Design a protein around this nucleic acid. Structure first.
Ligand SMILES: [W+6]
Ligand SMILES: [W+6]
Ligand SMILES: [W+6]
Ligand SMILES: [W+6]
Ligand SMILES: [W+6]
Ligand SMILES: [W+6]
Ligand SMILES: [W+6]
Ligand SMILES: [W+6]
Ligand SMILES: [W+6]
Ligand SMILES: [W+6]
Ligand SMILES: [W+6]
Ligand SMILES: [Zn+2]
Ligand SMILES: [Zn+2]
Ligand SMILES: [Zn+2]
Ligand SMILES: [Zn+2]
Ligand SMILES: [Zn+2]
Lengths: 269, 269, 254, 256, 250
DNA sequence: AATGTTGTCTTATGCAATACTC
DNA sequence: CTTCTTTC
DNA sequence: ATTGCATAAGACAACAGTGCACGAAAGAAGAAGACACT
DNA sequence: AATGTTGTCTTATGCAAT
DNA sequence: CTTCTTTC
DNA sequence: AGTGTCTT
């Protein structure tokens, strides 16, 4: 049956259940036949990726431009968020230039303070010599991303949800439909980012401004296990941050801290 | 604090968790406040009951065109599947014409038999008076689809993902990567259709041939309950088909048969 | 330390106390650096005032707001003095700091108008007026006016702008000034205006909880440090021993 | 560990990270050791900085030709008696023999760099050359620090072996060599990798295992091999061109 | 590719594997290029055993001293003028700066390496020394370095137009082309460059092959969700196999 | 060089407190 | 006899 | 008595005729001529 | 007039031999 | 001193 | 005045 099944899959590439039933082969073997085939293994998962987040506020920032035509003429919205505090700062601009990046960054620093590093995309206004000189002056490390995959920029584009879903609702509330009047744009914006920092975020236990100015940093965390490349669970780690998607775990022997998917962490003892 | 919370949401449109905590209101009330707001319409009521299925073999067919450049210059693949037996029939054509549709349906009839009804999407070939007058002589019911949002012919469009992949796997297996030579295209077709229809489809207990020529039609099914618009569970129904996604259920008092989502059916007693 | 402080003052013109503390410089030296330059409870009561600024044209009028205890400062540029401008500046102020209790203004028309009046009722803020420019209500707001009217001028001259700041860089001047004032120390106190406002600290541990122990009882004396999927890690306050328990077995203590 | 670290610093005056790693000593101790002693950017092999310095302690061969890799911090120095068009080409030749053939080299406008002979030497090797004043910050500023590094290591080494103001000739070429081994093979500073490991890729992986990558249209394309596979990203090389690109983990799956 | 390969061999006389990889040419052509030119127990560890001997080439008139690593295949030559026991200390001094500190250096017992100055010099570096008891396995290694340096300098100098001798101003300069040709670019039919074996995995593992047998000789490089990438130690071919088909080797 | 995000949306259980049906 | 339009 | 097994979970995935069309912003690449070197 | 669908895909659970 | 390649 | 890197 094993050779007959191999020949059958060679010619027809029959799935494993059919070969297992037809030739009376156990499922592990039939699956082994599909696995050993080069063309039929065209769907392995091989998925991973952590945003990542910072262990404390004013450490990791993310910034990107988004287009909200309601703010016309200055329809470009530069959005920035701290990964630890989840607090949002936004300004309006008419053109996406490095001047707008250093201006917006100047405002966000004027509100929340100076961050350790800002994580942007591969845009031309962020990769300009002038921007590198600006962050060279303010001492902020620069981290770009994949060319076209904003998944790593997730928790800033996630902000672009609120900033665009809150501006819609608040603008419709004051009776503005096609374009927000220029006299009330500042009020709209101020109330907008006012509602998203001093007040909780749905099921969030604290407010983003409280998580900003009064963050929770564990000195030494509780012990956890992590699932390592071979699929095994390894003791000897402690967790410092455990969020919804991902957790930050620290190795006990070195104090190195890494971010891993939640599914790959379980309590140690 | 019902009015205080309402005012807070009026101005800032604060979520229910925040208003419930801030104004000490129970959950149901705060949620009612968010619900009662028009510009915060959640909504999210989109009726999920959606069922494109038929009862018996040769009763309801699905037919659509798709592009696979491996068969060029005749790369146009016409696909027709029987919704009850899941038996696929595909024919290659250089250009999508009503004559090509009548040729395809002529072959699928020459293999499976004359169907009672065929459901397609409203294209140029199907909505022509010529194809209409062709189904006229053969007595086959014609059912078009929504202009653009083709999610109902899915069990044929999904068939393309079942089809074209089995093409590639058979093409790469024979050393043909870019375009399959004209001499072996038809053999590729026959080998694909024989691999799909004459063997189990993954977890399928019967083969499409065993499901077509030896189908299983229940004289009368076991009793079930269905969840009705008000959310209640109503007795007095019997289930005739219970698949992975959807179920066909029959009303005991009238013998009227309707299709409903699996999640909306449970055993009666 | 002397060069770092000099560079810092060149760009932001930070006062001597802040540079002395930040760069570990003795008082006399840091002060000498500031000298060599030629152009050199919280959230209870606020103070608002308008001031002229022809260099910030077209939006020349600047609205300034300051807190009494935290010494914070928020500014907004406007093209003319209107009620919507006052409400905009106040919405930005409460956006950066939060909704206060009382705000002290003057007897001006923009602050005594109707559109400004009814805006106080919805947001719930108290107002106080009196003599047109008295010494107890209009004192510190003028100090802030000196703060901003000096900072914008000196920084704008420091980046190469002399007569009129271009329309693009104006907001950047705003942000740089507010950064030089909020986050930096203009007084002998080691606490910045930002520090004196939010009282920034770090949660060394979690809030107190009770945990259900093997016998089913609920025991006080624990704080929770981690709440993961399914289980929670809780720490005993008297010993710092940490154990993992099911989420269902934890509830807030008091 | 305390004696091993003391001997290592005595001879080479190795920085604290290297001594901490070599003898398994914590950071506070290594830093105390450095204290107790009195005398104490994308891809590599792309841009070099070359300049001359005059160490009077290396006389009569006082002129030192220094070339440091910008993306590796690894340096190559050779002694010369006079700065001419031949000494520069010999130094560049030795450096190329040590750390591989680069593509660009940044120097100043000296006569030894603008001569026709050296120009032809640049042309025959297919290497780029640019001028300068010098005195910039982004470029032309790394070699300046490298010169102080080299003169400092030579000074601390020769003065460590009993030579004060002039190094004996019969030992000159040695007191230079012992410097480079301390500035290339061992880690100098506070980083993790060694300046030699901070050089070339390292050991540019001729072949990786086969992968597919998801291309703009959503398709999965064969013909790539992965050279680096990190948590977020993988480095994959096209087999037909040797072009290497970085892509998200979710867009890669095993081939075959 | 034809011009790139021809130019590369003209200047450096690079072997066929290196030219094939560098210019993406199939092996038959590169071998034809090598043809067209007229003058044209080894797995312990790198940086452990060195062979050093003196062999004279008259083209560098008025000596040469070689030092080769027995694993990385790299070579270092200093071209001394007078053969003394000091030239050995300076030669090894220049070698341990490029190839690093070796764990041992073995030389055939001569009147030059057995001196007390050389022995104290060995002890000063913590490097063990053993006079060669020069072996038959090294007969094809250190002499290989000798004649490979001689022939490489001969072909480079002849290609430059210098028949008998080389100008002393160009002598120290052409030393680099030889080491660069014999160290960076690959030589012979080998796969790894002499550099790629000095600065460079599995547990190892065994893999279950199509016939069901378990084969030793593989190391695993990637273990993802479901599948593993394993590398054959001999050919360096890498294949992906199911997790169930891999187990630790020893 | 540099990784997917949470803010909500409905319905499904487990336990106090009216309002009923004997 | 062109365009013009609705679908795939 | 533990471990080989054919079943769960519990998702990923892509079918929809084809995808590349354009703009902005900042930098890189190619090209015609002026002052210095040859 | 005319309803998002399944075949794989990985890693966790119940019946019988060394 | 214009016209391409990159990315958002 | 070749021609050549440097200017724009
Ligand atoms: W034809
Ligand atoms: W033909
Ligand atoms: W034909
Ligand atoms: W004026
Ligand atoms: W004036
Ligand atoms: W004035
Ligand atoms: W004036
Ligand atoms: W003025
Ligand atoms: W003026
Ligand atoms: W004036
Ligand atoms: W003036
Ligand atoms: Zn197959
Ligand atoms: Zn609302
Ligand atoms: Zn100043
Ligand atoms: Zn020292
Ligand atoms: Zn040759």
């Amino acid at each position: 049956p094993l050779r007959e099944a191999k020949d059958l899959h060679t010619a027809l590439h029959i799935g494993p259940r059919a070969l297992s039933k037809a030739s009376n082969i156990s499922m592990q073997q039939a699956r082994e036949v599909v696995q050993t085939c080069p063309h039929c293994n065209s769907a392995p998962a091989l998925e991973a990726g952590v945003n990542p987040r910072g262990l404390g506020p004013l450490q990791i920032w993310q910034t990107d431009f988004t287009l909200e035509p309601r703010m016309a003429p200055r329809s470009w919205l530069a959005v920035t968020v701290d990964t630890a505090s989840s607090a949002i700062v936004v300004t309006q601009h008419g053109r996406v230039t490095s001047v707008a990046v250093q201006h917006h960054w100047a405002t966000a620093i004027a509100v929340m303070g100076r961050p350790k590093a800002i994580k942007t995309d591969n845009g031309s206004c962020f990769t300009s010599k002038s921007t590198r000189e600006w962050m060279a002056r303010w001492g902020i490390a620069h981290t770009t991303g994949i060319p076209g995959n904003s998944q790593g920029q997730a928790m800033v584009e996630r902000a672009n949800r609120m900033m665009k879903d809150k501006i819609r609702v608040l603008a419709e509330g004051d009776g503005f439909m096609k374009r927000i009047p220029t006299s009330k744009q500042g009020e709209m914006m101020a109330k907008a980012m006012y509602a998203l920092n001093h007040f909780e975020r749905g099921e969030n236990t604290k407010t983003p401004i409280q998580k900003h100015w009064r963050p929770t940093v564990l000195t030494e965390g509780p012990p956890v296990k992590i699932r390592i490349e071979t699929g095994e669970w390894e003791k000897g780690w402690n967790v410092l941050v455990w969020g919804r998607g991902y957790a930050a775990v620290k190795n006990r022997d070195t104090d190195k801290v890494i971010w891993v998917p939640s599914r790959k962490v379980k309590p140690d003892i």
